[PDB]
Amino acid sequence: ESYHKPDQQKLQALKDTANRLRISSIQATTAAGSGHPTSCCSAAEIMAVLFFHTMRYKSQDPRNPHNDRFVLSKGHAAPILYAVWAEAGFLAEAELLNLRKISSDLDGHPVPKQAFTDVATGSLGQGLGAACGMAYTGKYFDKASYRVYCLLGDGELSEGSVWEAMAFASIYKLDNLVAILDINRLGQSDPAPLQHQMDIYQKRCEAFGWHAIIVDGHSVEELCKAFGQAKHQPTAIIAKTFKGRGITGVEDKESWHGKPLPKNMAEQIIQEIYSQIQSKKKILATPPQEDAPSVDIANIRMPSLPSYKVGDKIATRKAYGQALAKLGHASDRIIALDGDTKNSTFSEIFKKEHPDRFIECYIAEQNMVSIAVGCATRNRTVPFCSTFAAFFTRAFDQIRMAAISESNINLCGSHCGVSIGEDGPSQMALEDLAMFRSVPTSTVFYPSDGVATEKAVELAANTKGICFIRTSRPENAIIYNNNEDFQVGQAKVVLKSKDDQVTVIGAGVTLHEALAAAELLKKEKINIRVLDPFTIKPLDRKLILDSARATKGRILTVEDHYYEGGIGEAVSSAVVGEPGITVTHLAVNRVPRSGKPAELLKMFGIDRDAIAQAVRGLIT
Amino acid sequence: ESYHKPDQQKLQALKDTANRLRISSIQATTAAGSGHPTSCCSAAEIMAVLFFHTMRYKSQDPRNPHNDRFVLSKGHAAPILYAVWAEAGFLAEAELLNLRKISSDLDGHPVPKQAFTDVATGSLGQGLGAACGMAYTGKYFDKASYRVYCLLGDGELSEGSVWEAMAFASIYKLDNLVAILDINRLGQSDPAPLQHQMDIYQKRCEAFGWHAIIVDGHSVEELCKAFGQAKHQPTAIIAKTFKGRGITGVEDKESWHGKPLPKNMAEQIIQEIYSQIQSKKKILATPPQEDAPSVDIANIRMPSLPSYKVGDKIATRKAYGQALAKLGHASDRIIALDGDTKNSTFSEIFKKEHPDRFIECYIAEQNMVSIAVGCATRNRTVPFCSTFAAFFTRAFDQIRMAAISESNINLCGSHCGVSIGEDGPSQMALEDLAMFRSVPTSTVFYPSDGVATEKAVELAANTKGICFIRTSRPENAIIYNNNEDFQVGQAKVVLKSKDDQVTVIGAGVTLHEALAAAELLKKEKINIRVLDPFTIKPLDRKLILDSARATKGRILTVEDHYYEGGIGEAVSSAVVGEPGITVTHLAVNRVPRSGKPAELLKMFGIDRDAIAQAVRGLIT
Numbered sequence A, B: 001e002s003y004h005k006p007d008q009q010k011l012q013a014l015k016d017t018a019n020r021l022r023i024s025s026i027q028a029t030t031a032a033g034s035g036h037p038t039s040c041c042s043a044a045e046i047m048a049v050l051f052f053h054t055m056r057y058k059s060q061d062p063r064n065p066h067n068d069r070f071v072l073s074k075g076h077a078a079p080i081l082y083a084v085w086a087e088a089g090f091l092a093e094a095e096l097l098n099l100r101k102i103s104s105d106l107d108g109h110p111v112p113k114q115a116f117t118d119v120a121t122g123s124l125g126q127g128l129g130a131a132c133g134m135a136y137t138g139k140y141f142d143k144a145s146y147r148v149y150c151l152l153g154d155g156e157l158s159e160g161s162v163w164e165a166m167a168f169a170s171i172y173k174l175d176n177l178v179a180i181l182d183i184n185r186l187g188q189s190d191p192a193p194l195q196h197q198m199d200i201y202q203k204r205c206e207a208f209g210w211h212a213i214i215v216d217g218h219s220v221e222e223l224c225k226a227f228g229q230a231k232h233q234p235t236a237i238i239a240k241t242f243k244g245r246g247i248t249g250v251e252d253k254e255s256w257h258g259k260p261l262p263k264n265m266a267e268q269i270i271q272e273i274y275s276q277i278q279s280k281k282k283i284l285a286t287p288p289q290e291d292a293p294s295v296d297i298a299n300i301r302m303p304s305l306p307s308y309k310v311g312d313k314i315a316t317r318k319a320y321g322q323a324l325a326k327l328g329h330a331s332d333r334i335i336a337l338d339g340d341t342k343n344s345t346f347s348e349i350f351k352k353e354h355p356d357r358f359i360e361c362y363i364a365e366q367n368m369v370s371i372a373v374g375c376a377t378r379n380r381t382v383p384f385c386s387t388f389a390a391f392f393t394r395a396f397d398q399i400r401m402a403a404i405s406e407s408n409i410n411l412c413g414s415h416c417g418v419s420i421g422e423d424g425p426s427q428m429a430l431e432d433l434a435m436f437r438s439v440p441t442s443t444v445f446y447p448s449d450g451v452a453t454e455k456a457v458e459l460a461a462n463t464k465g466i467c468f469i470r471t472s473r474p475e476n477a478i479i480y481n482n483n484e485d486f487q488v489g490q491a492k493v494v495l496k497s498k499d500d501q502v503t504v505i506g507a508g509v510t511l512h513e514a515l516a517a518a519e520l521l522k523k524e525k526i527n528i529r530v531l532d533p534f535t536i537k538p539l540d541r542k543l544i545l546d547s548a549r550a551t552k553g554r555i556l557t558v559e560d561h562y563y564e565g566g567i568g569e570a571v572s573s574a575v576v577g578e579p580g581i582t583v584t585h586l587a588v589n590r591v592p593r594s595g596k597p598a599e600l601l602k603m604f605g606i607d608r609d610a611i612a613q614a615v616r617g618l619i620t
């Protein structure tokens, strides 16, 4: 479609719109007694032009799959986002005044309970990565005409995650993506480092492969023109603005970030702004080309049962890659992402079979998670991210925000625990159960063999929320029949007898150590019950207690993880106060070191001999 | 000192050195059966020139405070680090062959049990930030002549944390810092994005304010020359190299990252490399100018007791800033860092009083933690970092690696829980107890009033490991006398009577809600015991159980945190299986939303009325 070059009346209407957006942002934050009107006001012309000249969207259906996407990365400008959606006719204008109330959904930062919000962005520096996932999806998966626009602050640009996204967009030629940089000189507590050195921003953006245009961010004409040309590259509109623009005596001043105008001041400023508005008539939104495809919503099923053989040996990391590739044959919705670790996590198997649905994210875990979140928005794909579980700690804030975003993403972290051996603690995930259990929407799978791994992948694909699958580096025996039924929140008793003296709960490598301990103890005429949780969250409390009541109330948990936040603590919280129930823990008590896997399991007190000794001490 | 321009014999000796380093890296990784010889070999000339021409250090005292610093950011090149320290005469050459053994300290990645290692770096992208902290300390605190050199991989440069460090170094004019980029074309599982596009690397470095020099990374002469001029800016030596350099048939090839040569191959390659070595004579290290000052090691004490008044109201976030500024008067070792949040965390009070010891880190939490780690190396400073606790999740991998680095840093996270009110969940720390409890060397302080906050700051300053102080946004009453004694692992019973029916454990805002619940329950003739943990890690198990035995075995925990990994789970793990002991939990069950603090405490079931109801249900 051609650019529609606006006339002076349209330009004036866009100015009027910007000023209405300023007034609303002030009114709402003054009413609330909190918020960030000066951060809204620097962005008012940008927002007016995007929503009422450049973008194409259905105003009454913000989630429509054909719409252009807008991501407010500087999420504390939420009041002006709400104001544009009232101006567009979706929100009632009276509701704006209920900003931040417990009776409203116009919360302090944007959240997906709002139809017009796809991702939550209040932790700065994350919106551009989500926008990259949306743009990648638009260009390569949906193959649709929608564009993606992301508004960032200048202080925000200090976050490394932004630059990971910058680099991703140029690697992947996201010529459907526009970043708008609100260069208002100031952050929260001081000027942003570069202030109004517009040329350095341009140099940085260009060095990272973007087409960079410096504009007057308070000129509706310059904005219309800059937004109105498509490029063959991701485009950065570097907008020189003033914080608090239009608020006389606050514009360009320190000490005003996140400070509402008092009521007396708001009334005076609003009258000033209102005196600049030429007409009350509002501009209408323009709708999109409806070329996004249908996506199916059905259950994704593996094409056959697992085909492992009991007693064969495979690492659960390898079983993950096999299972993910298998699942990719059943549905085109499955996509895989990895951070330069595909030959360690075995996501390379998916890449080999389904290359068009694999996204190489390079050594940039933060951005990888954000790409996945963006790809999952509007249910366009079902993503599986992978790296070493230890390196998901690099992305915890992205994961945390993914739950606030109500996102359905799947994460598989390999190389858990000391059982990796020789690389040492930098590579050892010992806190990943703690981290993922603390994520409110999470489901935590810890498969102990290849069969359980395949079933975990299938279940994860069909489970909402943040799904985490913990995989292991070393090879262990297949213990489950291929036709064993697995469910979220259902554990398995893998060894039992009528005279079991302890219930030993292990997972992954420690399950296999517990089975070996049972063989040791047999020599001594001591039987133990062995339980494999399958999911750590939710935990099968019923089977755990039923087991413990069969074994004189005694539970021993053994885990390749630190003591805090892992399996032992989950079990203890589940059962504390149950009469007759005792819980004893074996876990890793300190930062490990290099050695062979078996040597480290021994050193850190979580191998067969440590388990056997703990069982004997219980009994006596 | 002038540059010493090397003769051809010195250059040949540096080539010989590089080749010896290659041979050792191959021998050690072949002996181990794991490791990364091709990543060593690309860096061999760089390492030879740095250690045997450019840097100044005491070879027999690697930790000496006068020494130049070297940071191996690409930590999987550890075998070549070990080899240089054997070449320098510190390590025995035979020990190199014990790489990765449980009987050795030559672990898979560098760790500070090695005298020659200050920070652990195996999680990529973190070394440059630590190096920035070292350089900042050298230039501004020690005011010493040592320089700081940091070797990075090219794949590694995809990490956003690197670019945060890049920007920090130019903001702070770190003209004593050199980054060496090993542009060997390849990452782990594919070519690095930019491959050998040396000009783009240069453009990126220059756009971020560095003086950038492209060199042949296998030319000892070019390296000597590039390293031999100081600049008025941080300097990036952008070295074009080949992965596996010198290994015939492996050089510049895929499928060799992290793969040892077999033994048969190693023998053939080593003979080839050895045939290139002209002389066995080794170059000697050159020592430093001894101009680093004395740093005292004594206990840091507050200059007076707290001066709060019982019944006055202050937020613990404000008490933190007051206490940190006070402590800064007692010792010059205290430094403060903050990520554009100083006016929210109240670290601005320290900045006002001690500006030369405040480091503005901007909106870059990853880098902030790494700067702190670097500043703490060799005990040069005692750093206190602050931001919102929620945003420490952005830096979890840096924190995790700080514990592997045996680092003594202090972190204060504000704005915990739903009690912040209107900003909503993006700002609410609800997983920070889970995260910090999972860090092995951590001490977790949760002060409930201003007095406890001041005492926590003092105790943290004098405590080794990762200290975390959780502060709160709203004002609460002072409840402790100024002369109350506080200790790590010692809780306080703040309300008791002889007929207490439940022990209620709360902290911060929930302690105050528990005290208000006690007043509600009095009306009903029900007394409760109220316990303030002070430290969540370590937990005063003795006082908790002694309390519970006085209150019919009943414990109720109430926390402004998610259920997993917080106070309730810590208490449950501590006491599970104690006869007669029951533990009931109140916590936040899902992602919150905006509202007034009191409204959210109510919505999420952790205010006075929720506590009173849980107590009644126990009793009945």
Ligand SMILES: Cc1ncc(C[n+]2c([C@](O)(CO)[C@@H](O)[C@H](O)COP(=O)(O)O)sc(CCOP(=O)(O)OP(=O)(O)O)c2C)c(N)n1
Residues within 6 Å of the ligand: A038, A039, A042, A074, A075, A076, A122, A123, A124, A125, A152, A153, A154, A155, A156, A157, A182, A184, A186, A187, A188, A192, A243, A257, A258, B339, B340, B341, B343, B344, B363, B391, B394, B423, B427, B473
């Ligand atoms: C990852 C990260 N790190 C820091 C911050 C804090 N922060 C912002 C807010 O969190 C708002 O989102 C902050 O203002 C709080 O509301 C303050 O709470 P109080 O209780 O003290 O009232 S916003 C911000 C500065 C951003 O500057 P720019 O990017 O330049 O944007 P602009 O406003 O100039 O347009 C900071 C540091 C967050 N949120 N995320």
Ligand SMILES: Cc1ncc(C[n+]2c([C@](O)(CO)[C@@H](O)[C@H](O)COP(=O)(O)O)sc(CCOP(=O)(O)OP(=O)(O)O)c2C)c(N)n1
Residues within 6 Å of the ligand: A339, A340, A341, A343, A344, A363, A391, A394, A423, A427, A473, B038, B039, B042, B074, B075, B076, B122, B123, B124, B125, B152, B153, B154, B155, B156, B157, B182, B184, B186, B187, B188, B192, B243, B257, B258
């Ligand atoms: C933050 C982060 N993310 C990813 C990685 C993985 N990784 C590296 C290693 O972790 C080594 O430190 C990896 O090779 C493991 O040893 C493999 O374990 P296996 O069990 O599979 O054997 S190293 C690396 C690639 C780095 O490339 P460059 O920066 O270009 O360096 P160079 O080798 O070319 O000089 C990756 C992705 C880590 N560690 N950290």
Ligand SMILES: [Ca+2]
Residues within 6 Å of the ligand: A153, A154, A155, A182, A183, A184, A185, A186, A187, A192
């Ligand atoms: Ca700004």
Ligand SMILES: [Ca+2]
Residues within 6 Å of the ligand: B153, B154, B155, B182, B183, B184, B185, B186, B187, B192
């Ligand atoms: Ca490389």
